[PDB]
Amino acid sequence: MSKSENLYAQAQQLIPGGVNSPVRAFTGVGGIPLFIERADGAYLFDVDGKAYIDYVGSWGPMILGHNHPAIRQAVIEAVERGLSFGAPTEMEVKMAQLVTDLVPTMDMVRMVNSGTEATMSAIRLARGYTGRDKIIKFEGCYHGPNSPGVPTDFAKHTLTCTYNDLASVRQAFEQYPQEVACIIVEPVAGNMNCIPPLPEFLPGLRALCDEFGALLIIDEVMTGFRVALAGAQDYYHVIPDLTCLGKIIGGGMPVGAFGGRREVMNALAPTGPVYQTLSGNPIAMAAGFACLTEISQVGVYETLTELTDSLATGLRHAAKEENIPLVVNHVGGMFGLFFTNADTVTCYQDVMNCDVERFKRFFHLMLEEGVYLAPSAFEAGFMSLAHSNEDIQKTVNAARRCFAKL
Amino acid sequence: MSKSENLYAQAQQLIPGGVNSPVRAFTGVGGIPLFIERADGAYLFDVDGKAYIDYVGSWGPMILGHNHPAIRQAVIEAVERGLSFGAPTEMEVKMAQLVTDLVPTMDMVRMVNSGTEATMSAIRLARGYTGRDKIIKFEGCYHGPNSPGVPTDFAKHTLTCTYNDLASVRQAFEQYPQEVACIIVEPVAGNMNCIPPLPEFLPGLRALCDEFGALLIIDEVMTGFRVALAGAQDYYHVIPDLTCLGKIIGGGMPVGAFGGRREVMNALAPTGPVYQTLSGNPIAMAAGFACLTEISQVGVYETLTELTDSLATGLRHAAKEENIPLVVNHVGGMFGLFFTNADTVTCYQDVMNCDVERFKRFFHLMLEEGVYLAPSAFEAGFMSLAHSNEDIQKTVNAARRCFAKL
Numbered sequence: 001m002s003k004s005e006n007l008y009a010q011a012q013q014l015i016p017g018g019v020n021s022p023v024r025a026f027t028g029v030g031g032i033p034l035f036i037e038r039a040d041g042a043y044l045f046d047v048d049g050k051a052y053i054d055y056v057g058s059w060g061p062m063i064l065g066h067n068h069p070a071i072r073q074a075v076i077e078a079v080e081r082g083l084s085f086g087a088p089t090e091m092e093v094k095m096a097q098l099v100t101d102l103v104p105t106m107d108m109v110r111m112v113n114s115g116t117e118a119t120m121s122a123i124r125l126a127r128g129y130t131g132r133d134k135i136i137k138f139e140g141c142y143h144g145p146n147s148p149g150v151p152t153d154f155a156k157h158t159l160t161c162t163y164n165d166l167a168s169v170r171q172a173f174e175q176y177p178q179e180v181a182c183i184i185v186e187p188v189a190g191n192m193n194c195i196p197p198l199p200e201f202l203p204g205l206r207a208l209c210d211e212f213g214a215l216l217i218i219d220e221v222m223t224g225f226r227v228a229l230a231g232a233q234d235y236y237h238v239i240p241d242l243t244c245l246g247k248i249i250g251g252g253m254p255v256g257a258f259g260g261r262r263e264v265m266n267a268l269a270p271t272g273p274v275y276q277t278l279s280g281n282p283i284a285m286a287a288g289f290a291c292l293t294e295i296s297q298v299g300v301y302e303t304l305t306e307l308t309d310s311l312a313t314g315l316r317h318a319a320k321e322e323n324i325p326l327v328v329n330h331v332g333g334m335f336g337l338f339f340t341n342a343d344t345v346t347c348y349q350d351v352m353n354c355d356v357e358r359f360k361r362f363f364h365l366m367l368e369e370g371v372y373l374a375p376s377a378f379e380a381g382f383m384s385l386a387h388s389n390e391d392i393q394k395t396v397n398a399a400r401r402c403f404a405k406l
Numbered sequence: 407m408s409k410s411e412n413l414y415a416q417a418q419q420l421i422p423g424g425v426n427s428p429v430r431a432f433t434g435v436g437g438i439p440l441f442i443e444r445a446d447g448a449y450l451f452d453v454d455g456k457a458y459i460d461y462v463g464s465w466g467p468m469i470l471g472h473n474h475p476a477i478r479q480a481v482i483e484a485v486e487r488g489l490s491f492g493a494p495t496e497m498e499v500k501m502a503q504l505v506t507d508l509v510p511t512m513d514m515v516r517m518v519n520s521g522t523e524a525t526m527s528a529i530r531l532a533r534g535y536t537g538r539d540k541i542i543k544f545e546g547c548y549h550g551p552n553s554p555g556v557p558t559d560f561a562k563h564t565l566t567c568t569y570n571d572l573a574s575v576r577q578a579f580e581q582y583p584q585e586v587a588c589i590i591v592e593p594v595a596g597n598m599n600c601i602p603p604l605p606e607f608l609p610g611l612r613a614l615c616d617e618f619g620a621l622l623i624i625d626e627v628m629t630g631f632r633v634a635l636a637g638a639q640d641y642y643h644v645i646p647d648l649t650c651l652g653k654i655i656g657g658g659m660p661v662g663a664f665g666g667r668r669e670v671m672n673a674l675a676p677t678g679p680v681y682q683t684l685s686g687n688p689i690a691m692a693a694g695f696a697c698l699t700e701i702s703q704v705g706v707y708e709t710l711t712e713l714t715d716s717l718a719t720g721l722r723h724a725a726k727e728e729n730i731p732l733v734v735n736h737v738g739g740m741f742g743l744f745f746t747n748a749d750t751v752t753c754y755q756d757v758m759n760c761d762v763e764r765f766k767r768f769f770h771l772m773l774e775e776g777v778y779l780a781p782s783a784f785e786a787g788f789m790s791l792a793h794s795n796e797d798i799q800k801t802v803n804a805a806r807r808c809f810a811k812l
């Protein structure tokens with residue numbers, strides 16, 4: 001019995017399932033979860049001292065890798081001034097200025113405590129601004145059969161459409177022409193694994209919102225600062241009414257933000273009638289400020305994309321050599337692995353058709369090789385700027401050995 | 407124009423109303439909000455360098471005062487290991503053990519990212535465990551006419567009762583005998599200012615839940631570790647089915663937790679069918695662990711209560727000398743000021759009958775005296791263990807001078 005196994009047994013007595021986050025229970029992959037002592041650059045170190053090349057990046061915040069010195073220095077300096085104040089600070093203003101500089105579509109912005117609060121606040125704003133009740137969301141897309149604990153009437157004003165399918169979106173609008181307040185969309189799906197949009201998809205959503213008087217909300221909690229500096233909306237050339245941000249903007253600590261067109265944001269109280277939640281923590285905003293300053297430097301996204309592209313190329317080549325059907329999706333610093341015979345993976349149905357038991361065996365074989373992947377078939381992979389060409393070639397060599405055993 | 411006034415003008419261009427949290431806009435009191443540079447012990451220091459005796463305590467987290475060395479040391483040490491991991495840690499287990507040791511009614515516990523997530527998760531668990539849809543909540547009580555942005559059917563399964571009125575609770579149960587999943591109650595109301603329960607009230611809620619098969623959820627996000635070490639539930643001798651915690655458990659950074667009876671908590675996934683949100687951040691849990699270790703030492707609550715009682719006594723005496731009708735409510739390290747002719751303040755209607763314009767003038771006069779009070783008539787005051795007898799006598803002397811000017 002390892003230190004992780006002992007901590008898991010201990011945890012099970014006081015925490016249901018031994019974990020606070022059900023995905024961290026390894027339910028997706030099976031077995032006992034890995035407890036982590038520390039992290040540095042491209043690596044995770046478990047409680048038994050084993051090192052792993054990390055492709056989880058704490059679920060997307062660690063763009064610069066773990067424990068980046070500029071972020072660590074900014075937080076140690078901020079901590080001397082106190083953790084929180086319950087009153088506004090100069091960092092709130094500086095952070096709002098930096099975020100609106102980096103993401104130009106945002107004229108105004110509000111910082112919140114998490115990505116979930118940002119999406120919920122953006123949805124509430126769209127409903128208040130338009131005076132309409134219905135929202136369009138996509139299947140396999142999480143923003144923050146029937147599950148126990150929630151009353152049936154809770155999902156009454158939510159219209160679920162098919163990701164990358166403009167016809168299903170038009171159909172929902174044609175059913176409710178004057179009732180859709182907004183479309184909320186992940187510009188690159190990340191919660192059904194990594195699914196980039198079809199070229200027609202995001203401009204098609206912008207044109208439908210314009211036609212039917214709805215607001216377009218682009219949820220960049222995961223894609224923000226990962227796909228591109230100015231977001232996946234910049235990369236795919238689409239201008240939304242509102243943007244949601246999280247993760248990277250906190251530099252490793254929870255932070256959220258939502259922003260958009262000046263006249264939409266002006267509808268928020270005290271300026272307007274829409275009321276929203278907790279403000280951004282000062283330590284988390286100091287971490288995020290330092291992170292955003294570092295990634296806005298020349299050549300950062302070029303390097304991130306080159307690292308991710310080299311991993312995707314190597315994995316495809318390794319799978320082919322070992323006769324393992326595999327699709328790799330990737331954009332900027334984001335990627336997704338799919339064990340399927342399909343030529344492309346562009347929708348939720350394609351993800352559902354992947355070989356989940358094969359992914360589970362691959363995941364455990366990769367842990368043995370010292371590679372830590374997201375422990376789910378329905379989660380995207382993340383590249384960091386601390387990963388070296390050597391880390392990538394080691395990962396590709398490890399995947400080839402794992403593919404030979406499937 | 408001060409540095410706070412300049413930051414506020416700057417903030418208004420990019421942030422609706424110049425603040426992230428509408429209460430921090432000083433809407434309750436009027437005027438331009440104070441921007442805070444730093445905090446230490448019992449004091450806040452604004453961006454112009456002015457010192458204030460603080461009674462906001464960052465909205466309750468700062469039980470040990472601001473920037474406590476044990477908390478600062480624990481976070482600087484934890485930050486070296488990385489900010490977040492997206493995987494379980496030993497601190498999750500240690501923190502769960504410490505919280506269940508301090509609050510004995512909790513057999514099992516789950517850590518979440520905020521107090522709001524804890525109350526929402528506890529409400530979802532009660533609904534899932536009982537299979538019922540309705541919840542009872544109290545007016546003036548916030549857990550996380552009609553406001554724009556939320557559809558009308560959203561509050562369909564919520565029954566609002568009157569705080570400190572057992573008859574209104576019985577009436578709601580008699581209307582829906584087999585449909586109430588739970589009662590969620592702040593054991594000391596803090597979001598309509600400070601309203602302690604009547605002696606009959608919390609035991610009466612326990613007896614009604616038992617009669618009608620509902621779960622009793624005690625929301626201790628604010629009262630936890632403030633009223634007493636084992637919570638206001640220990641102080642008022644009531645045993646709930648579930649407890650919600652926040653604030654102090656994060657040592658100044660956002661953290662939430664919900665816990666309760668072993669068989670109720672076992673209904674959570676993967677062990678049971680109820681699914682919930684983000685896990686506790688490691689830096690925030692290191693801050694909370696150090697905070698909870700410090701306040702569980704002998705004599706802490708005795709000192710906290712003595713400080714709060716001496717402030718309440720001094721304020722009452724000062725108001726009487728100056729012919730200003732005032733009610734002071736207080737329990738453990740929590741207090742509330744009420745400008746009213748009423749003999750007692752025990753309900754929402756009493757709070758509504760207070761002189762709000764008098765509170766607004768008092769608040770601004772106290773800021774001039776170097777005392778920072780919650781900038782709302784509907785918010786409780788907080789005592790810290792860093793406040794000295796001299797701080798308290800200075801506050802009482804300042805309040806007497808302010809009462810003479812009302």
Ligand code: NA
Nearest residue numbers: 305306309332
């Ligand atoms: Na490329």
Ligand code: NA
Nearest residue numbers: 711712715738
């Ligand atoms: Na007393």
